[PDB]
Write a protein that binds this DNA or RNA. Structure first.
Ligand SMILES: [Mg+2]
Ligand SMILES: [Mg+2]
Ligand SMILES: [Mg+2]
Ligand SMILES: [Mg+2]
Ligand SMILES: [Mg+2]
Ligand SMILES: [Mg+2]
Ligand SMILES: [Mg+2]
Ligand SMILES: [Mg+2]
Ligand SMILES: [Mg+2]
Ligand SMILES: [Mg+2]
Ligand SMILES: [Mg+2]
Ligand SMILES: [Mg+2]
Ligand SMILES: [Mg+2]
Ligand SMILES: [Mg+2]
Lengths: 220, 239, 106, 53, 103, 62
RNA sequence: AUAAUAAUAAUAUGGUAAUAGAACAUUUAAUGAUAAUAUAUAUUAGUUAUUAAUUAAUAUAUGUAUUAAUUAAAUAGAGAA
RNA sequence: AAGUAAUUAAUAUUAGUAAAACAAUAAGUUAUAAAUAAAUAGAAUAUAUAUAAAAAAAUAUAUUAAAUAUUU
RNA sequence: AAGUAACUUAAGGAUAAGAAAUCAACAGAGAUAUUAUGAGUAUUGGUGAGAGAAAAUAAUAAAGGUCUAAUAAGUAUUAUGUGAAAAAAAUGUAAGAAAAUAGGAUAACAAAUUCUAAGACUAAAUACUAUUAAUAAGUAUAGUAAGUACCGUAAGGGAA
């Protein structure tokens, strides 16, 4: 009558599981795939035990360290952007700057963004979009490509919280009718990076107050 | 080029009716994806099985040698007895003892399924039902009716108490006495449920949001509100 | 916008059995993003490399034949169609070619 | 279609309605399907055994 | 206007109930038994010169201030200035960068 | 749940499919040996297939 | 360009530890006709390349299958403690 | 009267979706870029390029990316 | 293994916790409780066996804030002996501060942030029992008898 009593899974989906210790002809009879009489045959021995020879872990020297101050950026290639543009899934007349937030909205950069996005030149030879771009940084080649295109890149700084705010300030608004303002850089290295002209940083391209303040301090 | 590259038919007509009898009022065009999907029984199987798994109670709780009542005393000394060696009286080897590899308290049989797949399965079920001709849609207020809704009968999917009698009459008319039926309703039509409860064994009455693939598949004839149907379609859309 | 349009909106050739779609014709739906459902796959531990044409409505066999006609340099015996899910698997990594063949029609 | 149903006594499945695009076609369908069961009652379609012969 | 007031958050309302704007609370620390004594400041008791811990623990006070800011009603609270807590835009403006940043 | 063997993690690091490790043998007792020879004992090295399985089991999240 | 069955030619078909593939019995859940001329279990004699099922006779129940089949699962198979 | 369950990891097969997937309250997980101990470094037939040691820049070693089109 | 078993003491329908001398990072949050993620990440270990956070975002939750201290030294802190495998807060022994112009918080110092110890109350989510209702790919050797017969001096064991 009903289809309910005649449903099968797709061919290749399911196998029979191997039934041990259930008679000899089955194939996994008495010893049930264990062989004879070892430690293995009954007790548990850690799979990676080495017999007592110094193990692969214990032999070699331990190396390096994890930089906890490190912030790995999501990479995003010019090529991808170009592809998106070609498709027509890239709407930028409303918002003239393609910021990280904008990218994420588009799909452009997918998954979660923790620290920020680095732009990279994969399809620089075929890139030609006169666009304002913003990200956490970009490779020199990428920058060059952008400039050739008649585009405009600047590299901004975002702390985690700041970045989060940028990505979706709507949430923030919903929460406490406000968006948290952008933190200044404080780590010296970060400051240096944003000062650098070649990196195309937002401290010198916007002529920020912070730099000026620093200069003043130095003077006095 | 590629010859034979046609464009597919995107709609399908489902005749809206009036639930005490079933007099056709209008045709409504519903999309092909929710009512004329090709029958992919494997997808259906994935859904149904999943549903069953989630429905399990899982109360198999035999006593293991830990939970079994006996003491930990070694019943007989290791040697000197001339008998086989014995431990505590909880070993599964002995008749009174625990069970080996016991299953314990609430057994969890729940499984996952991608939402999209589930939606597809639902759609497929509906399509199957429609193909069978055992899908019947009931409605009125929302769409323009070609033929005017008759008097003494409404489009709400609702009704000694008289209602029960009416229901019985309907059943008699439609040759579906013994067979199981499924009423998919937009809201709690209490009256309808009351009417049906004499025939509870063969009648499912389900709120929109809680309808299951199994329930549709099980049912020999389904009666659904137009609004409810629309909602379902929206839920299991595609995008 | 609406899930069900009004009866007046729908035309006669948009319903089932009025296109003659079942008789030897087919249609390949594009993905959500709007790309051709042709994909590379690396099976059996990255060792074999196949291509897979997916979202096909109608007669897959006919489609396969048409594809073969279009691009004959891929041998005939390396075209494996599965009927349960209606998708056609090609032995090599010839995705680009397939895409090229496709786009021009739909 | 409604008229046909009413006069006939047997209601047609919505799928059929959707498909068939002419009165002649409808008639043919009816002849194929519902006529034989009307004449011979034990030749009818019991749902419990769909593969019945 | 009354309706609007009612609509406001609960904590703020509660605060208003016991510390209304009708009275002007002193900016600087005071006697603990004066009626213009600021809840947010550590006031001192006359008998036994012991600074009482603020009638509003700092966190709570901060929260209240934030709430006020959100609905514009900053001025109807007593003044915070003598607690070293500043908020949002003003804080950003008036912040002397750290010795480590400047040099 | 299952967890990384921290010792192994400290020694080994994930590079694409395989793992890399520091050559053993360079810590001391180096003098008298030719510096061109000891060049080989510096640098990283890739995991032998024999032991890849073990490594995988050791560090299931790398 | 498939499947099922049947041909022709060829090659292959011992097997412990072990690997791989395919079935059957039992019990439970989902779907489910039917019927005392029916069913279930048992004994005997048949039948089908047969751990199984079926046929006939016989005996005992029982107003009658969780029955055929497809899934899901297992306290799923015992001369070896 | 004896290979079971829970929480994980890796491989395979099939299904769904697919340059994205799951979840879609927001997060997050994996994929989308390789490399390095780490750092402000990072992709046009290869002989071009990327990262590491080296360096003015190449070479040299390792791994990677890169071939009227439709991204992995 | 493990602050687990065990022994001992004391309270309640629940107990504990709880309105920051907290977290954080120069932008911020805003009591506890414990679940997802974060994360088997940081941290740590005869650097073996192995152990392993927090911020943050989500749920669950209730009106969740609110004075009952004339605002707190032998207290903070230091030295020394102990002390939740990672994160302190505790504690025996002696030394022993300061008034918001002041304290605490980070190996250390300088900046800057943040909180106010040595006084307090607190529903809800939670644990366990008992009853009722529902659902059982649960049990008739997990289906009511009996803690009986019987065994042991006893604790205790324990049938059909
Ligand atoms: Mg064997
Ligand atoms: Mg041996
Ligand atoms: Mg043996
Ligand atoms: Mg062995
Ligand atoms: Mg053999
Ligand atoms: Mg058994
Ligand atoms: Mg036996
Ligand atoms: Mg035997
Ligand atoms: Mg309490
Ligand atoms: Mg208390
Ligand atoms: Mg522990
Ligand atoms: Mg004090
Ligand atoms: Mg206090
Ligand atoms: Mg006695």
């Amino acid at each position: 009558v009903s289809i309910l009593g005649q449903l099968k899974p797709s061919d290749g989906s399911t196998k029979s599981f191997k039934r041990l210790g259930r008679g000899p002809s089955s194939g996994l009879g008495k010893t049930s795939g264990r062989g004879q009489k070892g430690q293995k045959a009954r007790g548990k021995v850690k799979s990676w035990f080495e017999g007592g020879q110094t193990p692969i872990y214990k032999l070699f020297p331990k190396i390096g360290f994890t930089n906890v101050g490190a912030k790995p950026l999501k990479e995003l290639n010019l090529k991808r952007i170009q592809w998106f543009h070609d498709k027509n899934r890239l709407h930028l007349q409303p918002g003239e700057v393609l910021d990280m937030n904008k990218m994420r909205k588009l799909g452009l950069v997918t998954g979660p963004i923790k620290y920020g996005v680095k732009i990279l030149a994969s399809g620089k030879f075929h890139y030609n979009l006169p666009i304002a771009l913003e990200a956490s940084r970009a490779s020199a080649k990428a920058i060059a490509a952008i400039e050739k295109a008649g585009g405009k890149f600047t590299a901004r700084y975002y702390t985690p919280l700041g970045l989060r705010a940028h990505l979706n300030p709507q949430w923030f608004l919903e929460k406490r009718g406000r968006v948290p303002l952008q933190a200044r850089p404080t780590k010296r290295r970060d400051i240096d990076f944003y000062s650098k002209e070649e990196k195309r940083g937002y401290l010198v391209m916007e002529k920020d107050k912070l730099l000026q303040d620093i200069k003043e301090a130095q003077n006095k | 080029p590629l010859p034979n590259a046609a464009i597919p038919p995107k709609y399908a007509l489902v005749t809206v009716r009036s639930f005490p009898s079933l007099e056709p009022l209008t045709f409504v065009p519903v999309p092909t994806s929710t009512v004329a999907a090709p029958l992919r029984r494997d997808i259906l199987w994935r859904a149904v099985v999943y549903e069953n798994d989630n429905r399990r109670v899982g109360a198999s709780n035999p006593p293991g040698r830990s939970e079994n009542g006996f003491s930990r005393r070694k019943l007989m000394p290791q040697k000197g007895s001339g008998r086989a060696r014995v431990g505590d009286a909880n070993s599964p080897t002995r008749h009174n003892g625990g069970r080996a590899l016991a299953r314990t308290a609430p057994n969890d049989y729940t499984t996952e399924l991608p939402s999209k797949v589930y939606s597809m399965a639902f759609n497929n079920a509906l399509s199957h039902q429609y193909k069978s001709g055992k899908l019947f849609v009931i409605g009125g207020e929302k769409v323009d009716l070609i033929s005017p809704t008759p008097e003494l009968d409404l489009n709400r999917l609702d009704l000694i108490f008289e209602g029960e009698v009416i229901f019985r009459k309907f059943l008699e008319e439609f040759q579906l006495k013994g067979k199981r039926l499924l009423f998919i309703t937009d809201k709690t039509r209490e009256g309808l449920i009351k009417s049906s409860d004499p025939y509870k064994q063969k009648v499912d009455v389900i709120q929109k949001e809680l309808v299951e693939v199994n329930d549709i598949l099980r049912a020999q004839a389904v009666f659904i509100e137009l609004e409810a149907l629309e909602y379902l379609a929206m839920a299991h859309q595609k995008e | 916008a609406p899930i069900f349009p009004k009866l007046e909106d729908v035309k006669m050739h948009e319903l089932i059995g009025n296109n003659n779609f079942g008789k030897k014709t087919y249609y390949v739906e594009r993905s959500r993003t709007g790309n051709l459902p042709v994909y590379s796959a690396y099976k059996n531990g990255g060792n074999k490399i196949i291509t897979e044409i997916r979202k096909i409505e109608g007669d897959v066999i006919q489609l396969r034949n048409d594809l073969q006609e279009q691009l004959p340099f891929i041998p005939k015996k390396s075209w494996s169609v599965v009927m349960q899910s209606k998708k056609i698997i090609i032995k090599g990594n010839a995705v680009e070619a397939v895409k090229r063949v496709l786009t021009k029609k739909f | 279609t409604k008229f046909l149903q009413s006069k006939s006594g047997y209601l047609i499945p919505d799928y059929e309605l959707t498909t068939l695009s002419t009165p002649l076609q409808f008639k043919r369908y009816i002849k194929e399907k519902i006529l034989p069961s009307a004449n011979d009652p034990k030749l009818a379609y019991k749902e419990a055994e769909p593969n019945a012969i | 206007y009354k309706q609007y007031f009612d609509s406001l958050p609960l904590k703020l309302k509660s605060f208003f109930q016991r510390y209304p704007p009708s009275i002007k609370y002193s900016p600087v620390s005071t006697s603990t038994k004066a009626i213009n004594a600021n809840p947010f400041l550590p006031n001192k008791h006359p008998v036994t010169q012991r600074f009482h811990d603020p009638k509003y623990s700092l966190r709570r006070m901060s929260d209240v201030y934030k709430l006020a800011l959100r609905y514009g009603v900053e001025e109807f609270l007593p003044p915070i200035e003598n607690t070293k807590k500043l908020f949002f835009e003003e804080k950003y403006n008036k912040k002397t960068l750290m010795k480590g940043v400047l040099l | 749940l299952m967890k990384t063997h921290k010792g192994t993690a400290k020694r080994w690091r994930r590079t694409g499919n395989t793992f890399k490790r520091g050559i053993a043998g360079r810590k001391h007792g180096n003098i008298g040996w030719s510096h061109r020879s000891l060049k080989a004992l510096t640098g990283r090295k890739i995991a032998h297939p024999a032991y890849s399985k073990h490594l995988k089991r050791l560090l299931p999240y790398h």
